[PDB]
Amino acid sequence: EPAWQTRDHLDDPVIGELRNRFGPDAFTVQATRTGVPVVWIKREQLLEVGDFLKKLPKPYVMLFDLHGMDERLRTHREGLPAADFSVFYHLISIDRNRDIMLKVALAENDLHVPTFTKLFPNANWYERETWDLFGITFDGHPNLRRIMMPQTWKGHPLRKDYPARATEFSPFELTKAKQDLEMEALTFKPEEWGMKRGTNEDFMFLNLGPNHPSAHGAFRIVLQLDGEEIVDCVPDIGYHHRGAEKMGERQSWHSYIPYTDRIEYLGGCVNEMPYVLAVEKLAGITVPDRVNVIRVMLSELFRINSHLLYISTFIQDVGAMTPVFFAFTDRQKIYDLVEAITGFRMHPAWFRIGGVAHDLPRGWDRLLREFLDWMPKRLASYEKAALQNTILKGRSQGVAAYGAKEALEWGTTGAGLRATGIDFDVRKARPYSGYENFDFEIPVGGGVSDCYTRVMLKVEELRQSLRILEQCLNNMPEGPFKADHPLTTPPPKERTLQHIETLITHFLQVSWGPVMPANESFQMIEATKGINSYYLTSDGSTMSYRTRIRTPSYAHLQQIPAAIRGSLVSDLIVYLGSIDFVMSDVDR
Amino acid sequence: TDFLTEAHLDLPMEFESIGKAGSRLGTALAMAVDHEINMVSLVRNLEEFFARESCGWCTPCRDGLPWSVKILRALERGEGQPGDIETLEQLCRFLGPGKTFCAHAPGAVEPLQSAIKYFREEFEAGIKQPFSNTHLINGIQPNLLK
Amino acid sequence: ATIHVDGKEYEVNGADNLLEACLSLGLDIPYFCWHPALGSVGACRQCAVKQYQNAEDTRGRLVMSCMTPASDGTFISIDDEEAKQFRESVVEWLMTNHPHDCPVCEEGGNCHLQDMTVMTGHSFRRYRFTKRTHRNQDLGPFISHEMNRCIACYRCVRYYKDYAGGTDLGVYGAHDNVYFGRPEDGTLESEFSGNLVEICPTGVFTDKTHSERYNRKWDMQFAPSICQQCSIGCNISPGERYGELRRIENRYNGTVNHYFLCDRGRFGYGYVNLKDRPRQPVQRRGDDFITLNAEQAMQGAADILRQSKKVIGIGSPRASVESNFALRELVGEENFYTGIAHGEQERLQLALKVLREGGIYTPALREIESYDAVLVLGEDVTQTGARVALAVRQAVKGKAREMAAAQKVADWQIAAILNIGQRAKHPLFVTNVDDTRLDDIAAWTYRAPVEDQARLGFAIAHALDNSAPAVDGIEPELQSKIDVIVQALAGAKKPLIISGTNAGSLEVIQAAANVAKALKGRGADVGITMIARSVNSMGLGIMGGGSLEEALTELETGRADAVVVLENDLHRHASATRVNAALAKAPLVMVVDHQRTAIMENAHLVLSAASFAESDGTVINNEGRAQRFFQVYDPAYYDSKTVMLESWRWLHSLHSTLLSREVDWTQLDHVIDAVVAKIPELAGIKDAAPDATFRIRGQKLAREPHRYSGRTAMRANISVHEPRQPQDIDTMFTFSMEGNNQPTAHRSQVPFAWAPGWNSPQAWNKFQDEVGGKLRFGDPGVRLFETSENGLDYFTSVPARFQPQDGKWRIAPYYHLFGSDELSQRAPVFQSRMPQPYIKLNPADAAKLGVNAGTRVSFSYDGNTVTLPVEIAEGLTAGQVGLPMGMSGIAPVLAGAHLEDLKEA
C-alpha cells in the first residue's frame, strides 16, 4: 500500500478508545489521504471528546490547528454528515506520535460551537480567526472579535459567497480609517481588547506599532505597564493579511506554488515543500529519490539562510551591528548557489507537482563546495565575537522562559519546543522527502526555553543542516528530476516539445489545470521557524476547494503574553527578536 | 491462422484438434515454410497484407496493424529497438476477439503471436540499436528516466 | 434495471446502453464515436469496460459500453486494470499519427481528444515512426478543414448524412488513409453544417469565423442568450473577448434546440462587431452631428417630446417584450403601433389565434420529432425555420425507428435501425411555390401558388370531414394526390400540420387550421406548428397595436408630430418612398437602434441601443414560449466613451424624464413586473427566468470560466490601473469569474458547459439529468398559453383558383437562410455565402418575353424600376415571378404582391 493511499485509520487505538467511551454511533470516521484519523463528532459532545482525548494514558497534549470550512459548494461529500459549515480540530499526541482531526458539522443558521479555550488556550486566536473569516460563533469565548480583518469589517472573507478580488479603492474610506487611527489614541477603551482594570491610576498604556523597523514585519502591541513592568499585553495582528488561503481557492494547483513561497518569505523552498507534498498525495504521485535529495538540499540551504538571518537579527537586537553584515555576506553565498540552481534568490517557486522545475545545472557542486568550505569558520567567528559576549548573555539568559507544559499548551513548535527538552522534529518523527536517508542530529534543550537557549539551538541546527548539505553533495543519485506520473505538472520539457501526447498533457495542465480527484490531504514539515502544514481539500476540480495553512509564528505570537507578563519592555524586544517569526507567517 | 511447428504435423485436421493446438483449422489449405524463409520477413509480409486490407472502421486494427508493420520493417532491417517485441505482444493481446469490431484483426495477430512464440530468436536478432524517440534540444536538460 | 459498476449498485433505464447509463450516473467512461443524438456504432473502441457474467465472476470480457444494453442485473467494471490499459492503448493508437498541432489548433482547450488523452492518463510516447498526413479541402466560408487531426471516429458523416440529411460529405479511402470530407473543393451545402465544429471531437472542422479572431475557451465571457435570427428560439451561448462577440456556441435546451443550431444562428452574429454601429447618442443640429451623454440625451429628448402635441411609437419584432412595452408606455397604448405591415399583422394574429384558441396542442421543437406524419403548408421551413426542418427529418425517420422496435432492436443501435428501415419513412407532404430542401424526404411536393396551396389544404380538410367547406374544381390527378394525403393523415397516430406567416397568405393559415380541426374531430393526436418571421414576432402579436400603415397615415396627415422608432428598419415592412416621405415630414423622428439603419439620416435623435449581446430581455418564440436572454459583456468596459444602453432602459428613462423631469434608468425586474401587471397575456414572462436576487448558496452565476486570463493586462495599454468590475444590477449573472457554474447548481440558465476533465462540448453531459435528455432542474422558458378547451370553427372562405394576368406578375417569395434575415445579412461573413439575387421565371413566361437565363430584366414596383438577372425555374407556375425576400431592396412585404411592367433591360 502506497503512502498516499486513502485510509480510514480504523486500526488506530484512539478509534477503539472513542468507541469504548462514547459508543459506536456517536461519531463518523472519514477515510482521507491526510494520514491521520478524521472523526466527525456531534457538536454537543465536542467538549467531552476533547477532555477524553486530553485524559488519555498517552494524551493528546497540543491543539495543532483549529479552523473552519464552508461546505455548501462541496459536491463530493459521500460518507459525510450533512453540513453547511464545519469546524476542524487537529490534535497531536507527542507520546503516541499520532494525530487526530475532529470535525463538527454545522447548519447555516445554527453557526455556533462551544469554545475550546478551556481545554487548549491557543484556541483563543484560532477561534477568533474562525469567527473572523467564516462567521462561526464560539460560545463562551472571552473576547470573540475579528483578528485578521479590522473590527468594522462587513462579511466573512473565507465564505464561498464572498468575492475574493480587491474592491474599488476609495480615499474616503482611507481618510475614515486614518481618523479612526488618530482618534483611537484618545478614545481607547481597555475593555474591548480583553483588558481589565483600566486605570489604579498607575497603569501607563503604550503602543509599539503599527510600524516596526525590523525584518519580522510591522505589528502593534498595546502594553499596560506598572512602571517598567508589563502587567498586561494584547497584540494587534492581521496588518499583513494577504488572503493566501482564499487565493488558494482561486489559483490552480500548479499556479498556486509562488503564493506558497511568500507565506514565510525567508523560507522559500521550505515553504513550497509541504504544499507540493500534499498535492502529490492528492495526485497519488511517488517522486523518485533524486527529487527527494534535490528538495532536501534546497530546503536545507534555505534553512541555513533563514537561521543566519535570525541569528544576525537577534545579535543586532542585542546591540552588536557587524555580524549582520557578515551574515548577509554568507547569505549572498547561499543566494549564489540558489540563483544558479533556480534562477531566483528569495522566492524560487522551483518545486513542482511530481518534482522540480529543471535539472540541476552543470557545476552546482563547485558552488556547494565553496559554500561548505566558507561557512564553518564564519560561524565560529560569529560565536566568538557575539554569542559568547557576556553583555549578550545578560540580555538573553533567563528572559521570557517557559517549560514543556507551557510550550505544549500553546502549540509551540520548532526551537522553542526542543529548548523545553521535548525531542519532536518532523524530519525524524514523521519523515518526509527522503530525510530518513540522511544522518543528522536533532539538538534539544535542557528544559528551559530561554532566548539564549533558542538562539544556540538554532546555531546547532545550522551545523546539522551543513552536515545534511555535505551528505547531499557527496551522495547524488543520477536519475530523473520529475516523476513519470501523468499528473506531473508540467511534464518534462523536451518531451513536451517533441511528443504530441506530452504536449496535450502540458497544454491542459498549464491552462485549465491538473485535475485532482476529490480527496483531502495533509502534510506537515519542520519549517525554519517551527512546524508548517498544508491541509488541502479537492472537490475533484483543478483548483483547491480549501487550502488551510498552519504556521508556527501564529502560535508563538499567541504565546507571547503568557511568557512576558511581569517582565520589562526591553525583555519584550529581546523576546520578539528570539522567537524567529515573520508577520507574513502570522497573518498569511 | 497461427503458425505450427513440425511436431504439430501429426494431429488430425479437425476444428477442435487444431483449436486445442493453439491455431485455427480455417480453410484447411495449409502452407509450408522451409528453413530458408526468415520468419520476421514472412510475418512482415503477412502484416503488410492485413494492415492494408483493414476496412478502417475501428481503431485497434486501423491504427495498430501499421505500427506492427513498421516494427517488423525495422526488425527486418536490423533497426529494432528495445520494447518493440513487447509492443508486438501487447498488440496481439489488444487486437483479439471482442476488442475490434470484426474478426479481421484477431486473424491478423494470430501469425504474429504464433511466430513470436515459436521463433523468438529471429525477432530478437533484429533489435540492434538502443531506444531513441527524442532528439536533444539545446538548452533543455532531459529528464533522465531509469 | 439493476446494474453493478465497480461493486456499486445502480438503477438505470433498461432501454439505454451502458455508456449513456453510466454517463447519466456521473461515472466517467472515455468515448469518441458515440453521441447522444446519433446513437451507437462501436467504431472508436474507446468506451471499453469489463463485463462479467455474474457476481461470482473474475475473468470477465472487454465490451464496448456504447454497444452493450444496460439490462437488468448487469455486472461491469470501468476501473478494471485491463479495461484501463485498453482505453489507454486506444488513445495511444490515435496519438501515433496525430500532428504536433495543439498550440496552432483552434480546438485547443475545447478539444474532446485532449480531454480523453488526459482522462486515460496517457502522456508518454514510445511510437517513433512517421505520421501519416493529409491534404486539406476548402469547405466554404464557415468551416475550416484540417484532416491531419482526424481520429476516424465517423461522427461527422453520421451526423451530416444520417441525421442532417446532407449529401456532400462522406468518408473516402481505406485502412488508415480514411478521409472525411467532400468529393471536391466546395461549400458545404447543408443548412446545419455548422454543428460539425461541435460534433467533431478534434480540430478537423473548426469555426472559421471564430478562427479569424481566435481566442481560447477559458478566455471567453459567456452568457445564456436566445438566437435573434428567426422565430424558433434556439438557446445559444455567445462568447466574447476584448469587447467583440467572438463565437456563438450551442446552449443545450432539452425542449428546444438540444444539440444543434442552424448555420444562420451559428454564423450570422457578425453584425454585432460592425464598426458603423451607434456607440453613443447623436443629435443633428442643422447638417452637423453632436454626441451627447445619456443624461443630456434624456433631458433634450424629454423637452422636445413634451413640447410636441402627440408622440406615436413604432415597435419591432426584433426588439424584446420589455423594450416594446416601454415604448408602448412612453407613447401610450392608443398611440402605439406595431412596426409590421397590415397583412403581416393580420397573418400573425391569425396564427396566434390558431395557436392559443384553436384547441390543438402546439409542440415544442424537440417534440416535433415524435410525430408520424407531417403536412407542411406554404412554409419554406428550411430557409425560414431551419431547425424545424431538422426536427421534421427526425420525425420522418420515426418509421424506421418503429419497424426496428417491432423486431426488438434497441433504440440506440442506429446502424441496425437504418438497415431495417431501408427507405421506408413517415409521410411528408410539403407545399411551396417551388422546390424545397425537404423534397428529398418528402412523400409528395406540391408546387403551386399560395391560393392553390390553400385550396389543397381546404380540400384535404373537406376530405377528412364533410363539415369542412368544399373546394369546387379539383382535377382528378390532384384529387388522387389529395386522397393519398388524406389516407396518410387519417391513418396517422400523431399528425403534425406546419404552416407560417412566411407564405404571405391568410388562406394558407386558415387551411392549415381547418386540416388540424378535421384531424382533431376524428380523435387524432394532431399538433399544429406556426413559423413566424422574427425573434419576437409572437410577442409583438400578443402585445398588439396598429399596423405600420396606420402610423404612416398618422405621420402623413400631420396629426402626429413626434415618432419614436425602436429597432426597426422601416423599409422591410413598407415601401421606402412612403417611409422616407413620412419621416421627412415629421418634425421629430427619434430612433432607438443598435445598427446603422437607412432611416438614421432623417432621424433627429439617434439612441445607441444595445444589441442582444449587450442587453437583457425576453423574447417569444413561435411555440409561444417566453425565453430570457442575458447580457454578455459591458460595452463600456474597454471603451469608456461608449453609451450603449438597453432599449427599455432608454425608453423608461425617457418616460421618467418626460413625467417627473428626472432621469431614472430602471431595473429589469421592474419592467418585467410592469409587463405582467399591464398585460395579463404576457404574465408568463415573469417565470421565464428568476429575478436578479437569485443566488446559488449566496453567490451569483459566473459569466466567464475559472481560468479567465489577462485580467491585469487586457486594458493595460489604455491605463495600467485596473478598472472596477462591471456591475450587473439587471440579472443574477455577474460579469466575472466570482460566481457559480457548477453542473449540480439548482438553476436552468447555464452560460457555458464546463466540468473538470471535460473541457469540450461534452460537458453538457454533466449538466443534464440523463444524457440527451433535459437539463437537470428543467429546461429554461415557460409557455405563455395552454391548449384551449374549445377549438375554432371551420373557415369557410375558400379562395379561388390562381388566374395569371397579362402585365401582372404575382410575386412568389423565395426565402434564403443566408439573406432573408436583416441582421444576418449585415454580417460580413454572409456576403461570401450571399447568393446572387436572381429573379425566377417560368420557362413559358421567359419564352413569351424572349429572355434566356442570365439576362437582366427590369420591373417597376412602387413607381421605381429595378433590374435583376433571370434564373429559369421549372417548378414555378406561370403568372408568377420569383423574388428573394428580405434581400437588399426586396422587402419581405412584397411576398404575395403583384408586379407591373416586367421588361427586358
Ligand code: SF4
Ligand atoms: S477489425 Fe474489421 S471492422 Fe475493425 S477496421 Fe479492421 S477490418 Fe474494419
Ligand code: SF4
Ligand atoms: S485536435 Fe485536439 S489534440 Fe489534436 S492538435 Fe487540436 S487540440 Fe491538439
Ligand code: SF4
Ligand atoms: S473529421 Fe472529426 S468527426 Fe469526422 S471522423 Fe474525423 S475526428 Fe471524427
Ligand code: SF4
Ligand atoms: S433555426 Fe432560427 S432561432 Fe434557431 S439557430 Fe437558426 S436562425 Fe437561430
Ligand code: FES
Ligand atoms: S464510443 Fe463506444 S466504441 Fe466509440
Ligand SMILES: [Ca+2]
Ligand atoms: Ca444589463
